């Protein structure tokens, strides 16, 4: 299920979209995308 990370303690971020990528997904957004992916499916 949940991931298993190497570095123990978390690190804050300060970067831009033009710098390195980061997954920042709010929960209702990923929920709604799961609904939209579920409902779109001799």
């Amino acid at each position: 299920s949940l991931l298993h990370t190497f570095w123990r303690l978390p690190v804050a971020v300060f970067f831009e979209p033009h710098e390195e990528n980061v997954l920042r997904c709010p929960e209702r957004v990923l929920r709604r995308l799961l609904e939209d992916a579920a409902v779109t499916m001799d």
Binding site: W7, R8, L9, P10, V11, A12, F14
Partner: protein, 138 residues
Amino acid sequence: GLFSLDRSYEEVKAAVQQLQTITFRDATFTIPDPVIDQHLLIDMKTACLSMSMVANLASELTMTYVRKLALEDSSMLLVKCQELLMRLDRVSPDDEIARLSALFVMLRQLDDLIREQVVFTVCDVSPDNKSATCIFKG
């Protein structure tokens, strides 16, 4: 000087025989040992005591201070340094001020060892190396 207490063993004695000599540019030079007759002089005792005290106080206080610093963290260099403290490990406020003050006292009592000023630099060396010509730098 740091091996002054465990001199009774033989690995430490061979280590003293190793560290006492030095090879350099055509130099088989040897130094004297700071211990004589299995007891240490007060200068070296103060030196090793100050160094052991600053090492012990750094191993004690810094985890608490950087853990307090993570609430007001503003640089990623600071959060990753306490991670290695957690990796390595695996009170009255006036006493805390006393601990910090004694840390800085042991820091002040070590500047006679940890740094030194270059005095001369050689412009020319005379042949047979007996003398040389140096500018001053104070």
